[PDB]
Amino acid sequence: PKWERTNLTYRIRNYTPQLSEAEVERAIKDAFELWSVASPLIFTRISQGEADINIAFYQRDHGDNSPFDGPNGILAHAFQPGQGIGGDAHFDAEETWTNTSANYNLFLVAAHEFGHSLGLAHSSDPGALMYPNYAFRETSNYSLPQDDIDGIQAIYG
Ligand SMILES: [Ca+2]
Ligand SMILES: [Ca+2]
Ligand SMILES: [Zn+2]
Ligand SMILES: [Zn+2]
């Protein structure tokens, strides 16, 4: 699965109250930019209406047959490129969401989920963003690990 348009829209449908709205918006924007700088994709935010990629914070059963599980465990999930639910990214509202090294950093989690939104599966490289399990990495000048660059380059050339 892969997108056939280069300019994709996204919409943040709701917000965790644990971060300022500005910090939620910056986490999401920066997570998309990680992939944009390694691909031809251009991400465009809309405030209402139907976007290619919906982003939301939900708890437990939330209408897609993949319920969240409360604190810890599954932090978020995302759907492969396609119409409707395709591309969408959901975050477990019951987590602690941070902009620090404390569990769990929203920017890093979003970055992983957006890999799925663009067509990547999990990686077996423990250093890869797309590794199945979360590990905090310094965020200040974070760039995609080389394994993830390889992955998105394989899809979008
Ligand atoms: Ca959870
Ligand atoms: Ca969608
Ligand atoms: Zn979901
Ligand atoms: Zn994943």
Q: For residue 145, give the amino acid letter.
A: P
Determine the 3-state secondary structure of 53 from DSSP.
strand
Domain 1-157 in CATH 3.40.390.10: yes
Catalytic residue, candidates 4, 33, 50, 113: 113
Question: 149: CA distance to ligand 1 center in Å?
Answer: 28
Which residues share a beta bridge with 57? 91
Q: Please tell me the experimental approach by which this structure was elucidated.
A: X-ray
Tally of CB atoms within 10 A around 136: 13
Instruction: Quote the CA–CA distance of 77 and 11 in Å, as a whole number.
Output: 16
How are beta strands 89-92 and 76-78 bridged, if at all?
antiparallel
Q: Which helix (H) or strand (E) holds 109?
A: helix 106-118
- Closest by CA to 24, choosing from 57, 50, 48, 58, is 57
> How many CA atoms, within 13 angstroms, populate the side-chain half-sphere of residue 72?
1
| Alpha carbon distances (Å) from 98 to 17, 84, 104, 105, 118 | 11, 29, 6, 5, 24
Structural domain boundaries in the chain: 1-157
In the residue annotation, 33 being an active-site residue is answered as no
Question: CB neighbours of 133 closer than 8 A, spacing ≥ 6?
Answer: none
Which residues share a beta bridge with 91? 57, 76
* Binding site members for Ca(2+): 52, 69-70, 72, 74, 84, 86, 88, 92, 95
Question: 73: CA distance to ligand 3 center in Å?
Answer: 14
